[PDB]
Symmetry: C2
Subunit: 264 residues, 2 copies
């Protein structure tokens, strides 16, 4: 997509040499922002084929709040397998914070129901936020949330959403991060009888791994294709009742998929 | 400052009509980002005189962690007076979360000491974060944190910091928000023997109140002056031992101060 390729080129042009926790070198910049008008089309990268099956199941699983990977395994979605323990547990990652953030007094706060309620009853609110950055629970999580917090906003009948992503692998994760939250904006908007606005992506440590340099140069030589269109085939009674088959991406005509490896 | 005036003009050119909780109308945009290279000079607005005495005391008070306003009152700093109850209490706002975030198991987490430790011992970390968005404590706070969370980053001997501000009054608060966090970057860098990098400001609901429209037009007719220089007169033994008199702003030559009123 134009904004995504511009970010890639920017990391290449001005990223500084920087290692990760494993020791794998990266080129990195700190602080970046992109805006996708969801009325322009579903923001799925077209310069490489990106599959969404895993992403759709992951979002449904996030919304359900149980952090054991059983549901993902029932659907053969293996993207969380490397972090799960022997029982399929991950600790209180994303979903547990979204749906049942634990307080000091023993309550479990459902942030998704809170924001839905706020979008329907107080759309002007400047505090329609969901955070997964539960400081007291970080140590128990299999990994700290990368997509740490997000805020909603309503103007002129349109729902917008901004995500703060503390750490972003531009090549491997970003395309999926964008699509995930874009999908969630469509779902929230549908549930609040709103049109879709913009998805604003904000990044913290934004990087390209050095072993993704060939892939990055190849992707940069391709021209973005017209964006596809998200169609929601059914309107569920609530944000917790969406099903995998409700979503269809129409008009996706990407350039070929590009594999990128990870070090261990 | 150039970036600040550009944001003002942008809100004017494309902000949509939007009320606040009180009902005071605003012009607002959602999602904006600015970058200030702290080696270029201390980012204190020059298109209107901005006083920092209250801001310096507020930062010291944040760092100390006690949310009663007694220390502010001892120094005749009255900016939190409108939110304080009869005893001078505010509930667990900023400082309590920065220094003693309460967990479900009864611990109090010092995020400032955690990040300092992380900057000294693991500068490549992509999770050097401080959050004041403690979902379980929001109801007890006199008001929810506007400057909600911030992340640090180290590259080439320089400390950078990104702030996510969920709601920003461009005219009245922004100049002070920038200066506050810029000061904190200088202090953290000094304590970690690092040079200053960039302060990245990210905004959520970013607005101009309609009763600030004359002031905004007047400020926009002024040309930014060269930035001033922050001087720290002493190097304290820790981040908790800074004193008001340690800070001096040199070479500040602003255009005249501009008053802006608030509705009640």
């Amino acid at each position: 997509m134009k904004q995504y390729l511009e970010l890639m080129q920017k990391v290449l042009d001005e990223g500084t040499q920087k290692n990760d926790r494993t020791g794998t070198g990266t080129l990195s910049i700190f602080g970046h922002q992109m805006r996708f008008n969801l009325q322009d089309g579903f923001p799925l990268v077209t310069t490489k084929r990106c599959h969404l099956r895993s992403i759709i199941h992951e979002l449904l699983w996030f919304l359900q709040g149980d952090t054991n990977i059983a549901y993902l395994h029932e659907n053969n979605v293996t993207i969380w397998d490397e972090w799960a323990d022997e029982n399929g547990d991950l600790g209180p990652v994303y979903g547990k914070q979204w749906r049942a953030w634990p307080t000091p007094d023993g309550r479990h706060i459902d942030q998704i129901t809170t924001v839905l309620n706020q979008l329907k009853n107080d759309p002007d609110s400047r505090r329609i936020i969901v955070s997964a950055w539960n400081v007291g629970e970080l140590d128990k999580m299999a990994l700290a949330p990368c997509h740490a917090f997000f805020q909603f906003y309503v103007a002129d009948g349109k729902l917008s959403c901004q995500l703060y992503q503390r750490s972003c692998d531009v090549f491997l994760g970003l395309p999926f991060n964008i699509a995930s939250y874009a999908l969630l904006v469509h779902m929230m908007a549908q549930q609040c009888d709103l049109e879709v606005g913009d998805f604003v992506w904000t990044g913290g440590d934004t990087h390209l791994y050095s072993n993704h340099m060939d892939q990055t140069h190849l992707q940069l030589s391709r021209e973005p294709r017209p964006l596809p269109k998200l169609i929601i085939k059914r309107k569920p009674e609530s944000i917790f009742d969406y099903r995998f088959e409700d979503f269809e991406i129409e008009g996706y005509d990407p350039h070929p998929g590009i594999k990128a490896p990870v070090a261990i």
